Design an enzyme around this catalytic site. Structure first.
Site, PDB file in Angstrom:
ATOM      1  N   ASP A  77     -13.874   1.594  10.100  1.00 36.91           N
ATOM      2  CA  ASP A  77     -13.734   1.696  11.234  1.00 36.91           C
ATOM      3  C   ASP A  77     -14.417   3.202  11.491  1.00 36.91           C
ATOM      4  O   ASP A  77     -15.243   3.759  10.652  1.00 36.91           O
ATOM      5  CB  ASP A  77     -12.121   1.696  11.795  1.00 36.91           C
ATOM      6  CG  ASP A  77     -11.316   2.789  11.261  1.00 36.91           C
ATOM      7  OD1 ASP A  77     -11.761   3.372  10.238  1.00 36.91           O
ATOM      8  OD2 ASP A  77     -10.123   2.649  11.371  1.00 36.91           O
ATOM      9  N   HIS A  78     -14.235   4.087  12.579  1.00 39.35           N
ATOM     10  CA  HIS A  78     -14.458   5.488  12.910  1.00 39.35           C
ATOM     11  C   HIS A  78     -13.875   6.244  11.941  1.00 39.35           C
ATOM     12  O   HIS A  78     -14.663   7.307  11.573  1.00 39.35           O
ATOM     13  CB  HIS A  78     -14.110   5.633  14.169  1.00 39.35           C
ATOM     14  CG  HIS A  78     -12.769   5.512  14.635  1.00 39.35           C
ATOM     15  ND1 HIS A  78     -12.126   4.231  14.955  1.00 39.35           N
ATOM     16  CD2 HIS A  78     -11.615   6.543  14.432  1.00 39.35           C
ATOM     17  CE1 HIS A  78     -10.771   4.562  14.926  1.00 39.35           C
ATOM     18  NE2 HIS A  78     -10.515   5.850  14.904  1.00 39.35           N
ATOM     19  N   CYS A 107     -11.392   3.201   5.708  1.00 40.05           N
ATOM     20  CA  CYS A 107     -10.510   3.628   7.057  1.00 40.05           C
ATOM     21  C   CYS A 107     -10.047   5.012   6.750  1.00 40.05           C
ATOM     22  O   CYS A 107     -10.195   5.655   5.799  1.00 40.05           O
ATOM     23  CB  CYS A 107      -9.777   2.416   7.667  1.00 40.05           C
ATOM     24  SG  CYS A 107      -8.221   2.278   6.736  1.00 40.05           S
ATOM     25  N   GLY A 108      -9.154   5.536   7.705  1.00 37.33           N
ATOM     26  CA  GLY A 108      -8.577   6.908   7.418  1.00 37.33           C
ATOM     27  C   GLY A 108      -7.897   7.022   6.241  1.00 37.33           C
ATOM     28  O   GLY A 108      -8.052   7.820   5.387  1.00 37.33           O
ATOM     29  N   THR A 109      -6.945   5.854   5.752  1.00 38.61           N
ATOM     30  CA  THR A 109      -5.957   5.899   4.464  1.00 38.61           C
ATOM     31  C   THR A 109      -6.568   4.644   3.439  1.00 38.61           C
ATOM     32  O   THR A 109      -6.292   4.794   2.369  1.00 38.61           O
ATOM     33  CB  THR A 109      -4.983   5.444   4.787  1.00 38.61           C
ATOM     34  OG1 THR A 109      -4.688   4.090   5.542  1.00 38.61           O
ATOM     35  CG2 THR A 109      -4.260   6.617   5.541  1.00 38.61           C
ATOM     36  N   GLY A 110      -7.387   3.699   3.950  1.00 40.88           N
ATOM     37  CA  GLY A 110      -7.721   2.619   3.260  1.00 40.88           C
ATOM     38  C   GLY A 110      -6.681   1.487   3.514  1.00 40.88           C
ATOM     39  O   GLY A 110      -6.885   0.590   3.056  1.00 40.88           O
ATOM     40  N   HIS A 170      -7.686  -5.746 -14.234  1.00 44.05           N
ATOM     41  CA  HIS A 170      -6.453  -6.498 -14.243  1.00 44.05           C
ATOM     42  C   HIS A 170      -6.378  -7.386 -12.815  1.00 44.05           C
ATOM     43  O   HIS A 170      -5.892  -8.639 -13.014  1.00 44.05           O
ATOM     44  CB  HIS A 170      -4.929  -5.698 -14.049  1.00 44.05           C
ATOM     45  CG  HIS A 170      -5.018  -4.923 -15.316  1.00 44.05           C
ATOM     46  ND1 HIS A 170      -3.794  -4.428 -15.706  1.00 44.05           N
ATOM     47  CD2 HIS A 170      -5.561  -4.971 -16.471  1.00 44.05           C
ATOM     48  CE1 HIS A 170      -3.784  -3.804 -16.906  1.00 44.05           C
ATOM     49  NE2 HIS A 170      -4.921  -4.313 -17.476  1.00 44.05           N
ATOM     50  N   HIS A 193      -4.345 -11.914 -17.041  1.00 46.37           N
ATOM     51  CA  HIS A 193      -4.756 -11.221 -15.834  1.00 46.37           C
ATOM     52  C   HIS A 193      -5.329 -12.514 -14.893  1.00 46.37           C
ATOM     53  O   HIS A 193      -5.070 -12.244 -13.927  1.00 46.37           O
ATOM     54  CB  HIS A 193      -5.544 -10.051 -15.954  1.00 46.37           C
ATOM     55  CG  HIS A 193      -4.990  -8.911 -16.881  1.00 46.37           C
ATOM     56  ND1 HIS A 193      -5.514  -8.575 -18.109  1.00 46.37           N
ATOM     57  CD2 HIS A 193      -3.808  -8.124 -16.773  1.00 46.37           C
ATOM     58  CE1 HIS A 193      -4.865  -7.982 -18.695  1.00 46.37           C
ATOM     59  NE2 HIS A 193      -3.925  -7.541 -17.918  1.00 46.37           N
TER      60      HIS A 193
HETATM   61  O1  LIG Z   1      -1.622  -4.669 -10.629  1.00 44.05           O
HETATM   62  C1  LIG Z   1      -1.053  -5.328 -11.799  1.00 44.05           C
HETATM   63  C2  LIG Z   1       0.008  -4.550 -12.478  1.00 44.05           C
HETATM   64  O2  LIG Z   1      -0.704  -3.145 -12.609  1.00 44.05           O
HETATM   65  C3  LIG Z   1       0.819  -4.729 -13.692  1.00 44.05           C
HETATM   66  O3  LIG Z   1       2.015  -4.146 -14.057  1.00 44.05           O
HETATM   67  C4  LIG Z   1      -0.115  -4.814 -14.993  1.00 44.05           C
HETATM   68  O4  LIG Z   1      -1.309  -5.414 -14.698  1.00 44.05           O
HETATM   69  C5  LIG Z   1       0.463  -5.407 -16.206  1.00 44.05           C
HETATM   70  O5  LIG Z   1      -0.387  -4.894 -17.501  1.00 44.05           O
HETATM   71  P1  LIG Z   1       0.240  -5.348 -18.923  1.00 44.05           P
HETATM   72  O6  LIG Z   1       0.348  -6.863 -18.804  1.00 44.05           O
HETATM   73  O7  LIG Z   1      -0.902  -4.897 -19.716  1.00 44.05           O
HETATM   74  O8  LIG Z   1       1.592  -4.806 -18.998  1.00 44.05           O
HETATM   75  O1  LIG Z   2      -5.173   2.154   8.268  1.00 46.98           O
HETATM   76  C1  LIG Z   2      -5.713   2.451   9.468  1.00 46.98           C
HETATM   77  C2  LIG Z   2      -6.754   3.755   9.266  1.00 46.98           C
HETATM   78  O2  LIG Z   2      -5.914   4.716   8.757  1.00 46.98           O
HETATM   79  C3  LIG Z   2      -7.569   4.142  10.800  1.00 46.98           C
HETATM   80  O3  LIG Z   2      -8.826   4.784  10.377  1.00 46.98           O
HETATM   81  C4  LIG Z   2      -6.393   5.001  11.492  1.00 46.98           C
HETATM   82  O4  LIG Z   2      -5.483   4.236  12.036  1.00 46.98           O
HETATM   83  C5  LIG Z   2      -7.113   5.252  12.771  1.00 46.98           C
HETATM   84  O5  LIG Z   2      -6.324   6.433  13.489  1.00 46.98           O
HETATM   85  P1  LIG Z   2      -6.829   6.881  14.756  1.00 46.98           P
HETATM   86  O6  LIG Z   2      -6.892   5.820  16.020  1.00 46.98           O
HETATM   87  O7  LIG Z   2      -5.858   8.182  15.352  1.00 46.98           O
HETATM   88  O8  LIG Z   2      -8.365   7.470  14.568  1.00 46.98           O
END
Ligand SMILES: O=C[C@H](O)[C@H](O)[C@H](O)COP(=O)(O)O
Ligand SMILES: O=C[C@H](O)[C@H](O)[C@H](O)COP(=O)(O)O
Lengths: 148, 148
Positions: free
Chosen positions: B8-9, B65-68, B98, B133
Site C-alpha cells: 500500500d502507500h 505495508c506500514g507494519t507488514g 521451517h 517441517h
Molecule cells: O513456525 C514454526 C515454529 O517456529 C516452531 O516452534 C518450530 O518450527 C519448531 O522447530 P523444532 O521442530 O526444531 O522444535
Molecule cells: O497493516 C495495515 C498497514 O499497516 C497500513 O499501511 C496502514 O494501516 C495504513 O494506515 P494509514 O491509513 O493511517 O496510512
C-alpha cells in the site's frame, strides 16, 4: 473477557507465563495445549485457538511457537481470523487499531519474556479504530469469500 | 528467480528501495503496485502478489505495508500462500527453513531500510529444510482444505 491460548513445544514455556499473567489480571483463560515439551505440530494448536475465537467460545486468542510465524499462518487460514505476529508493542497496538486482530501471535525464541508480556498488555488494551480500517478488513473478508 | 513485489502507500517507499535492490542483484522483479503515495487498501496488493505466486507467474513475493501485518494476513487467505512478517533476519531464515514461506512481509514504519535489506537478503538465500517441517506445512494445507 475469555482469552484462548495455544502453542507448540516451541512456545510452551512462554504460554505458561502468559496464562499466569492473564489469570492474575482476572481474564478467563482457556488453554488449548500443548501441555508439555514433547515435539508437536503448531498447526493443530493454531487451529484449536482460531476455531475457538471463530465460534465465540473465546473472545480472542494468543498463539505462540518458536517464531510466531507458523502458528499465525495456520490460524489465518480460518475465515474471520486475523492473527498478528508482533515483536514489539507498536505492532501490537497497530494490529488492534488497524487490522482489528483477534489473535496475537508471539515467538518464544525471538522475544524475551518481559518484552512479550509488554506486547500482550498493549494488545489487550488497544482498540479498533474503524473507518478506512473497517473497509480494509472487509476486503480481507472478500479474499476469504473468493477462496471459500 | 522472478520476485513479485507489492505494497500500500504505507510500504511504497520501502518497495521502491527493495525493487532497486533486487534488480541490482539480477532478479526479475514484477511490481504489482501501488505506484505512488496516495492512500490505497493493502488487501488489493497483498492479493495481486499472492495470486502471482500461486499461479507460478512469480516464484516468490515480497509485500510491504506500514507494519507488514495487514498485507500478510490478506496474502495468507490465499490457499498455497505462506506469508511471513519478519522484523529480523533470524525470523526471515526460519520462515524459509521451517515454514517454507513463499511471501516475505515487511513493515516500512517498523524496520529501517538497511535492516529491511538485510532481512530480504537473508530470506532470498535461506532454504526449506523439509522433514517434520514438510509434515507441518501439510497440516496448514489441511486447514485450507477444511475451509475451502
Ligand atoms: O513456525 C514454526 C515454529 O517456529 C516452531 O516452534 C518450530 O518450527 C519448531 O522447530 P523444532 O521442530 O526444531 O522444535
Ligand atoms: O497493516 C495495515 C498497514 O499497516 C497500513 O499501511 C496502514 O494501516 C495504513 O494506515 P494509514 O491509513 O493511517 O496510512
Amino acid at each position: 473477557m475469555k482469552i484462548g491460548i495455544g502453542s507448540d513445544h516451541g512456545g510452551y514455556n512462554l504460554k505458561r507465563e502468559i496464562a499466569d499473567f492473564l489469570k492474575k489480571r482476572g481474564y478467563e483463560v482457556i488453554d488449548f495445549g500443548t501441555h508439555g515439551n514433547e515435539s508437536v505440530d503448531y498447526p493443530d494448536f493454531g487451529l484449536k485457538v482460531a476455531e475457538a475465537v471463530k465460534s465465540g467460545e473465546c473472545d480472542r486468542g494468543i498463539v505462540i511457537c518458536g517464531t510466531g510465524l507458523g502458528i499465525s499462518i495456520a490460524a489465518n487460514k480460518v475465515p474471520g481470523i486475523r492473527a498478528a505476529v508482533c515483536t514489539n508493542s507498536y505492532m501490537a497496538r497497530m494490529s488492534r487499531e488497524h487490522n482489528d486482530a483477534n489473535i496475537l501471535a508471539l515467538g518464544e525464541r525471538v522475544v524475551g519474556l518481559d518484552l512479550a508480556l509488554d506486547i500482550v498488555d498493549t494488545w489487550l488494551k488497544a482498540e479498533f479504530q474503524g473507518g478506512r480500517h473497517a473497509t480494509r478488513v472487509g476486503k480481507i473478508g472478500e479474499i476469504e469469500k473468493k477462496y471459500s
